[PDB]
Structure 1
């Protein structure tokens, strides 16, 4: 684990066969449409994937549709400006900051806030290095709260 002393290995591990299984009836177009609908309804990539797995009969959008789900969202144009994980981190940070504002003496929270900030800065940096974030994007503790939306 990047920050704790946590060393767990709980993980999804996908099956050997990566051409979709026989029982999968859904044609790709339908699944794409479903994905789009889910996106519209406010769900994030991971969440969307989960929904697809559970509510509909489909293991992996990658086996049914050549593309992964983020890619298809992008194609359809409903991709977030601000990437999933990063966004989540930002939200968490914001929450922490609110708590701090409320409740000044919380040392552990402060420590954890610092850690989350650091992680954001890593993630943020990575995104900048690609082209998902713009280069003009620092993350600010003052702004942050407004950013998430």
Structure 2
């Protein structure tokens, strides 16, 4: 774990079968359109995959079609300018700062906000080392509330 203690090995393990499940006679001719419609209706790719697994019964979009969900979203041009995890971290930091402004006596909240901003800086450094984020992206803490956009 990045901060604190606890190994917490809870996760999801993909099946050995890499290919599309045999019982799925469904055709991949419209699964990408389904995810595109879902993203248009407004869903982050994580919950797009979750909704696809639950309500559509088509696990491992990568197995159904040899291309992964955020990748097809980018290929269609729908993908957001800020990656999902970084945006969620920014939202958490914005909420925490909004709370702290009212309660400056919340030392624990201040500490965890420092931790969250450290994570934000590390992951933004990674994303701008890749070309997934503009080189001038900084995350100043003043206008992050509207930076979600």
Is TM (by shorter chain) over 0.5? yes
User: What is the CA-CA distance between 1:148 and the residue it aligns to?
Assistant: 1.0
| 3-state SS, counterpart of residue 14 of structure 2 | coil
Structure 1 vs Structure 2 CA RMSD: 0.7
Secondary structure of 1:29's counterpart equals coil
In structure 1, the partner of 2:11 is 11
- TM (normalized to structure 1)? 0.98
Q: Deviations over 1:39-96 (max 9, x none)?
A: 0111001000000000001011000111000000001110000000000000000000
Q: Equivalents in 1 of 2:15, 2:6: separation in Å?
A: 26
- How far is 1:143 from its partner? 1.2
User: Which blocks of at least 5 consecutive residues in structure 1 are unaligned?
Assistant: none
More deviation, 117-126/4-13:
4-13
Q: What's the CA shift for 1:6?
A: 2.1
Deviation, 1:101, is 0.5
Offset at residue 25 of structure 1 (A): 2.3
Q: Moved runs in structure 1, 4+ residues, more than 3 A? A: none
Shift of 1:7: 1.2
Give the length in aligned residue pairs. Answer: 149
CA distance in 1, matches of 2:122, 2:24: 39
1:29 Cα deviation (Å)?
2.3
Superposition deviation, residue 28 in structure 1: 1.5
Q: Deviations over 1:106-141 (max 9, x none)?
A: 000000000000000010000000011101011011
**What residue ranges of structure 2 are gaps of 5+ in the alignment?**
none
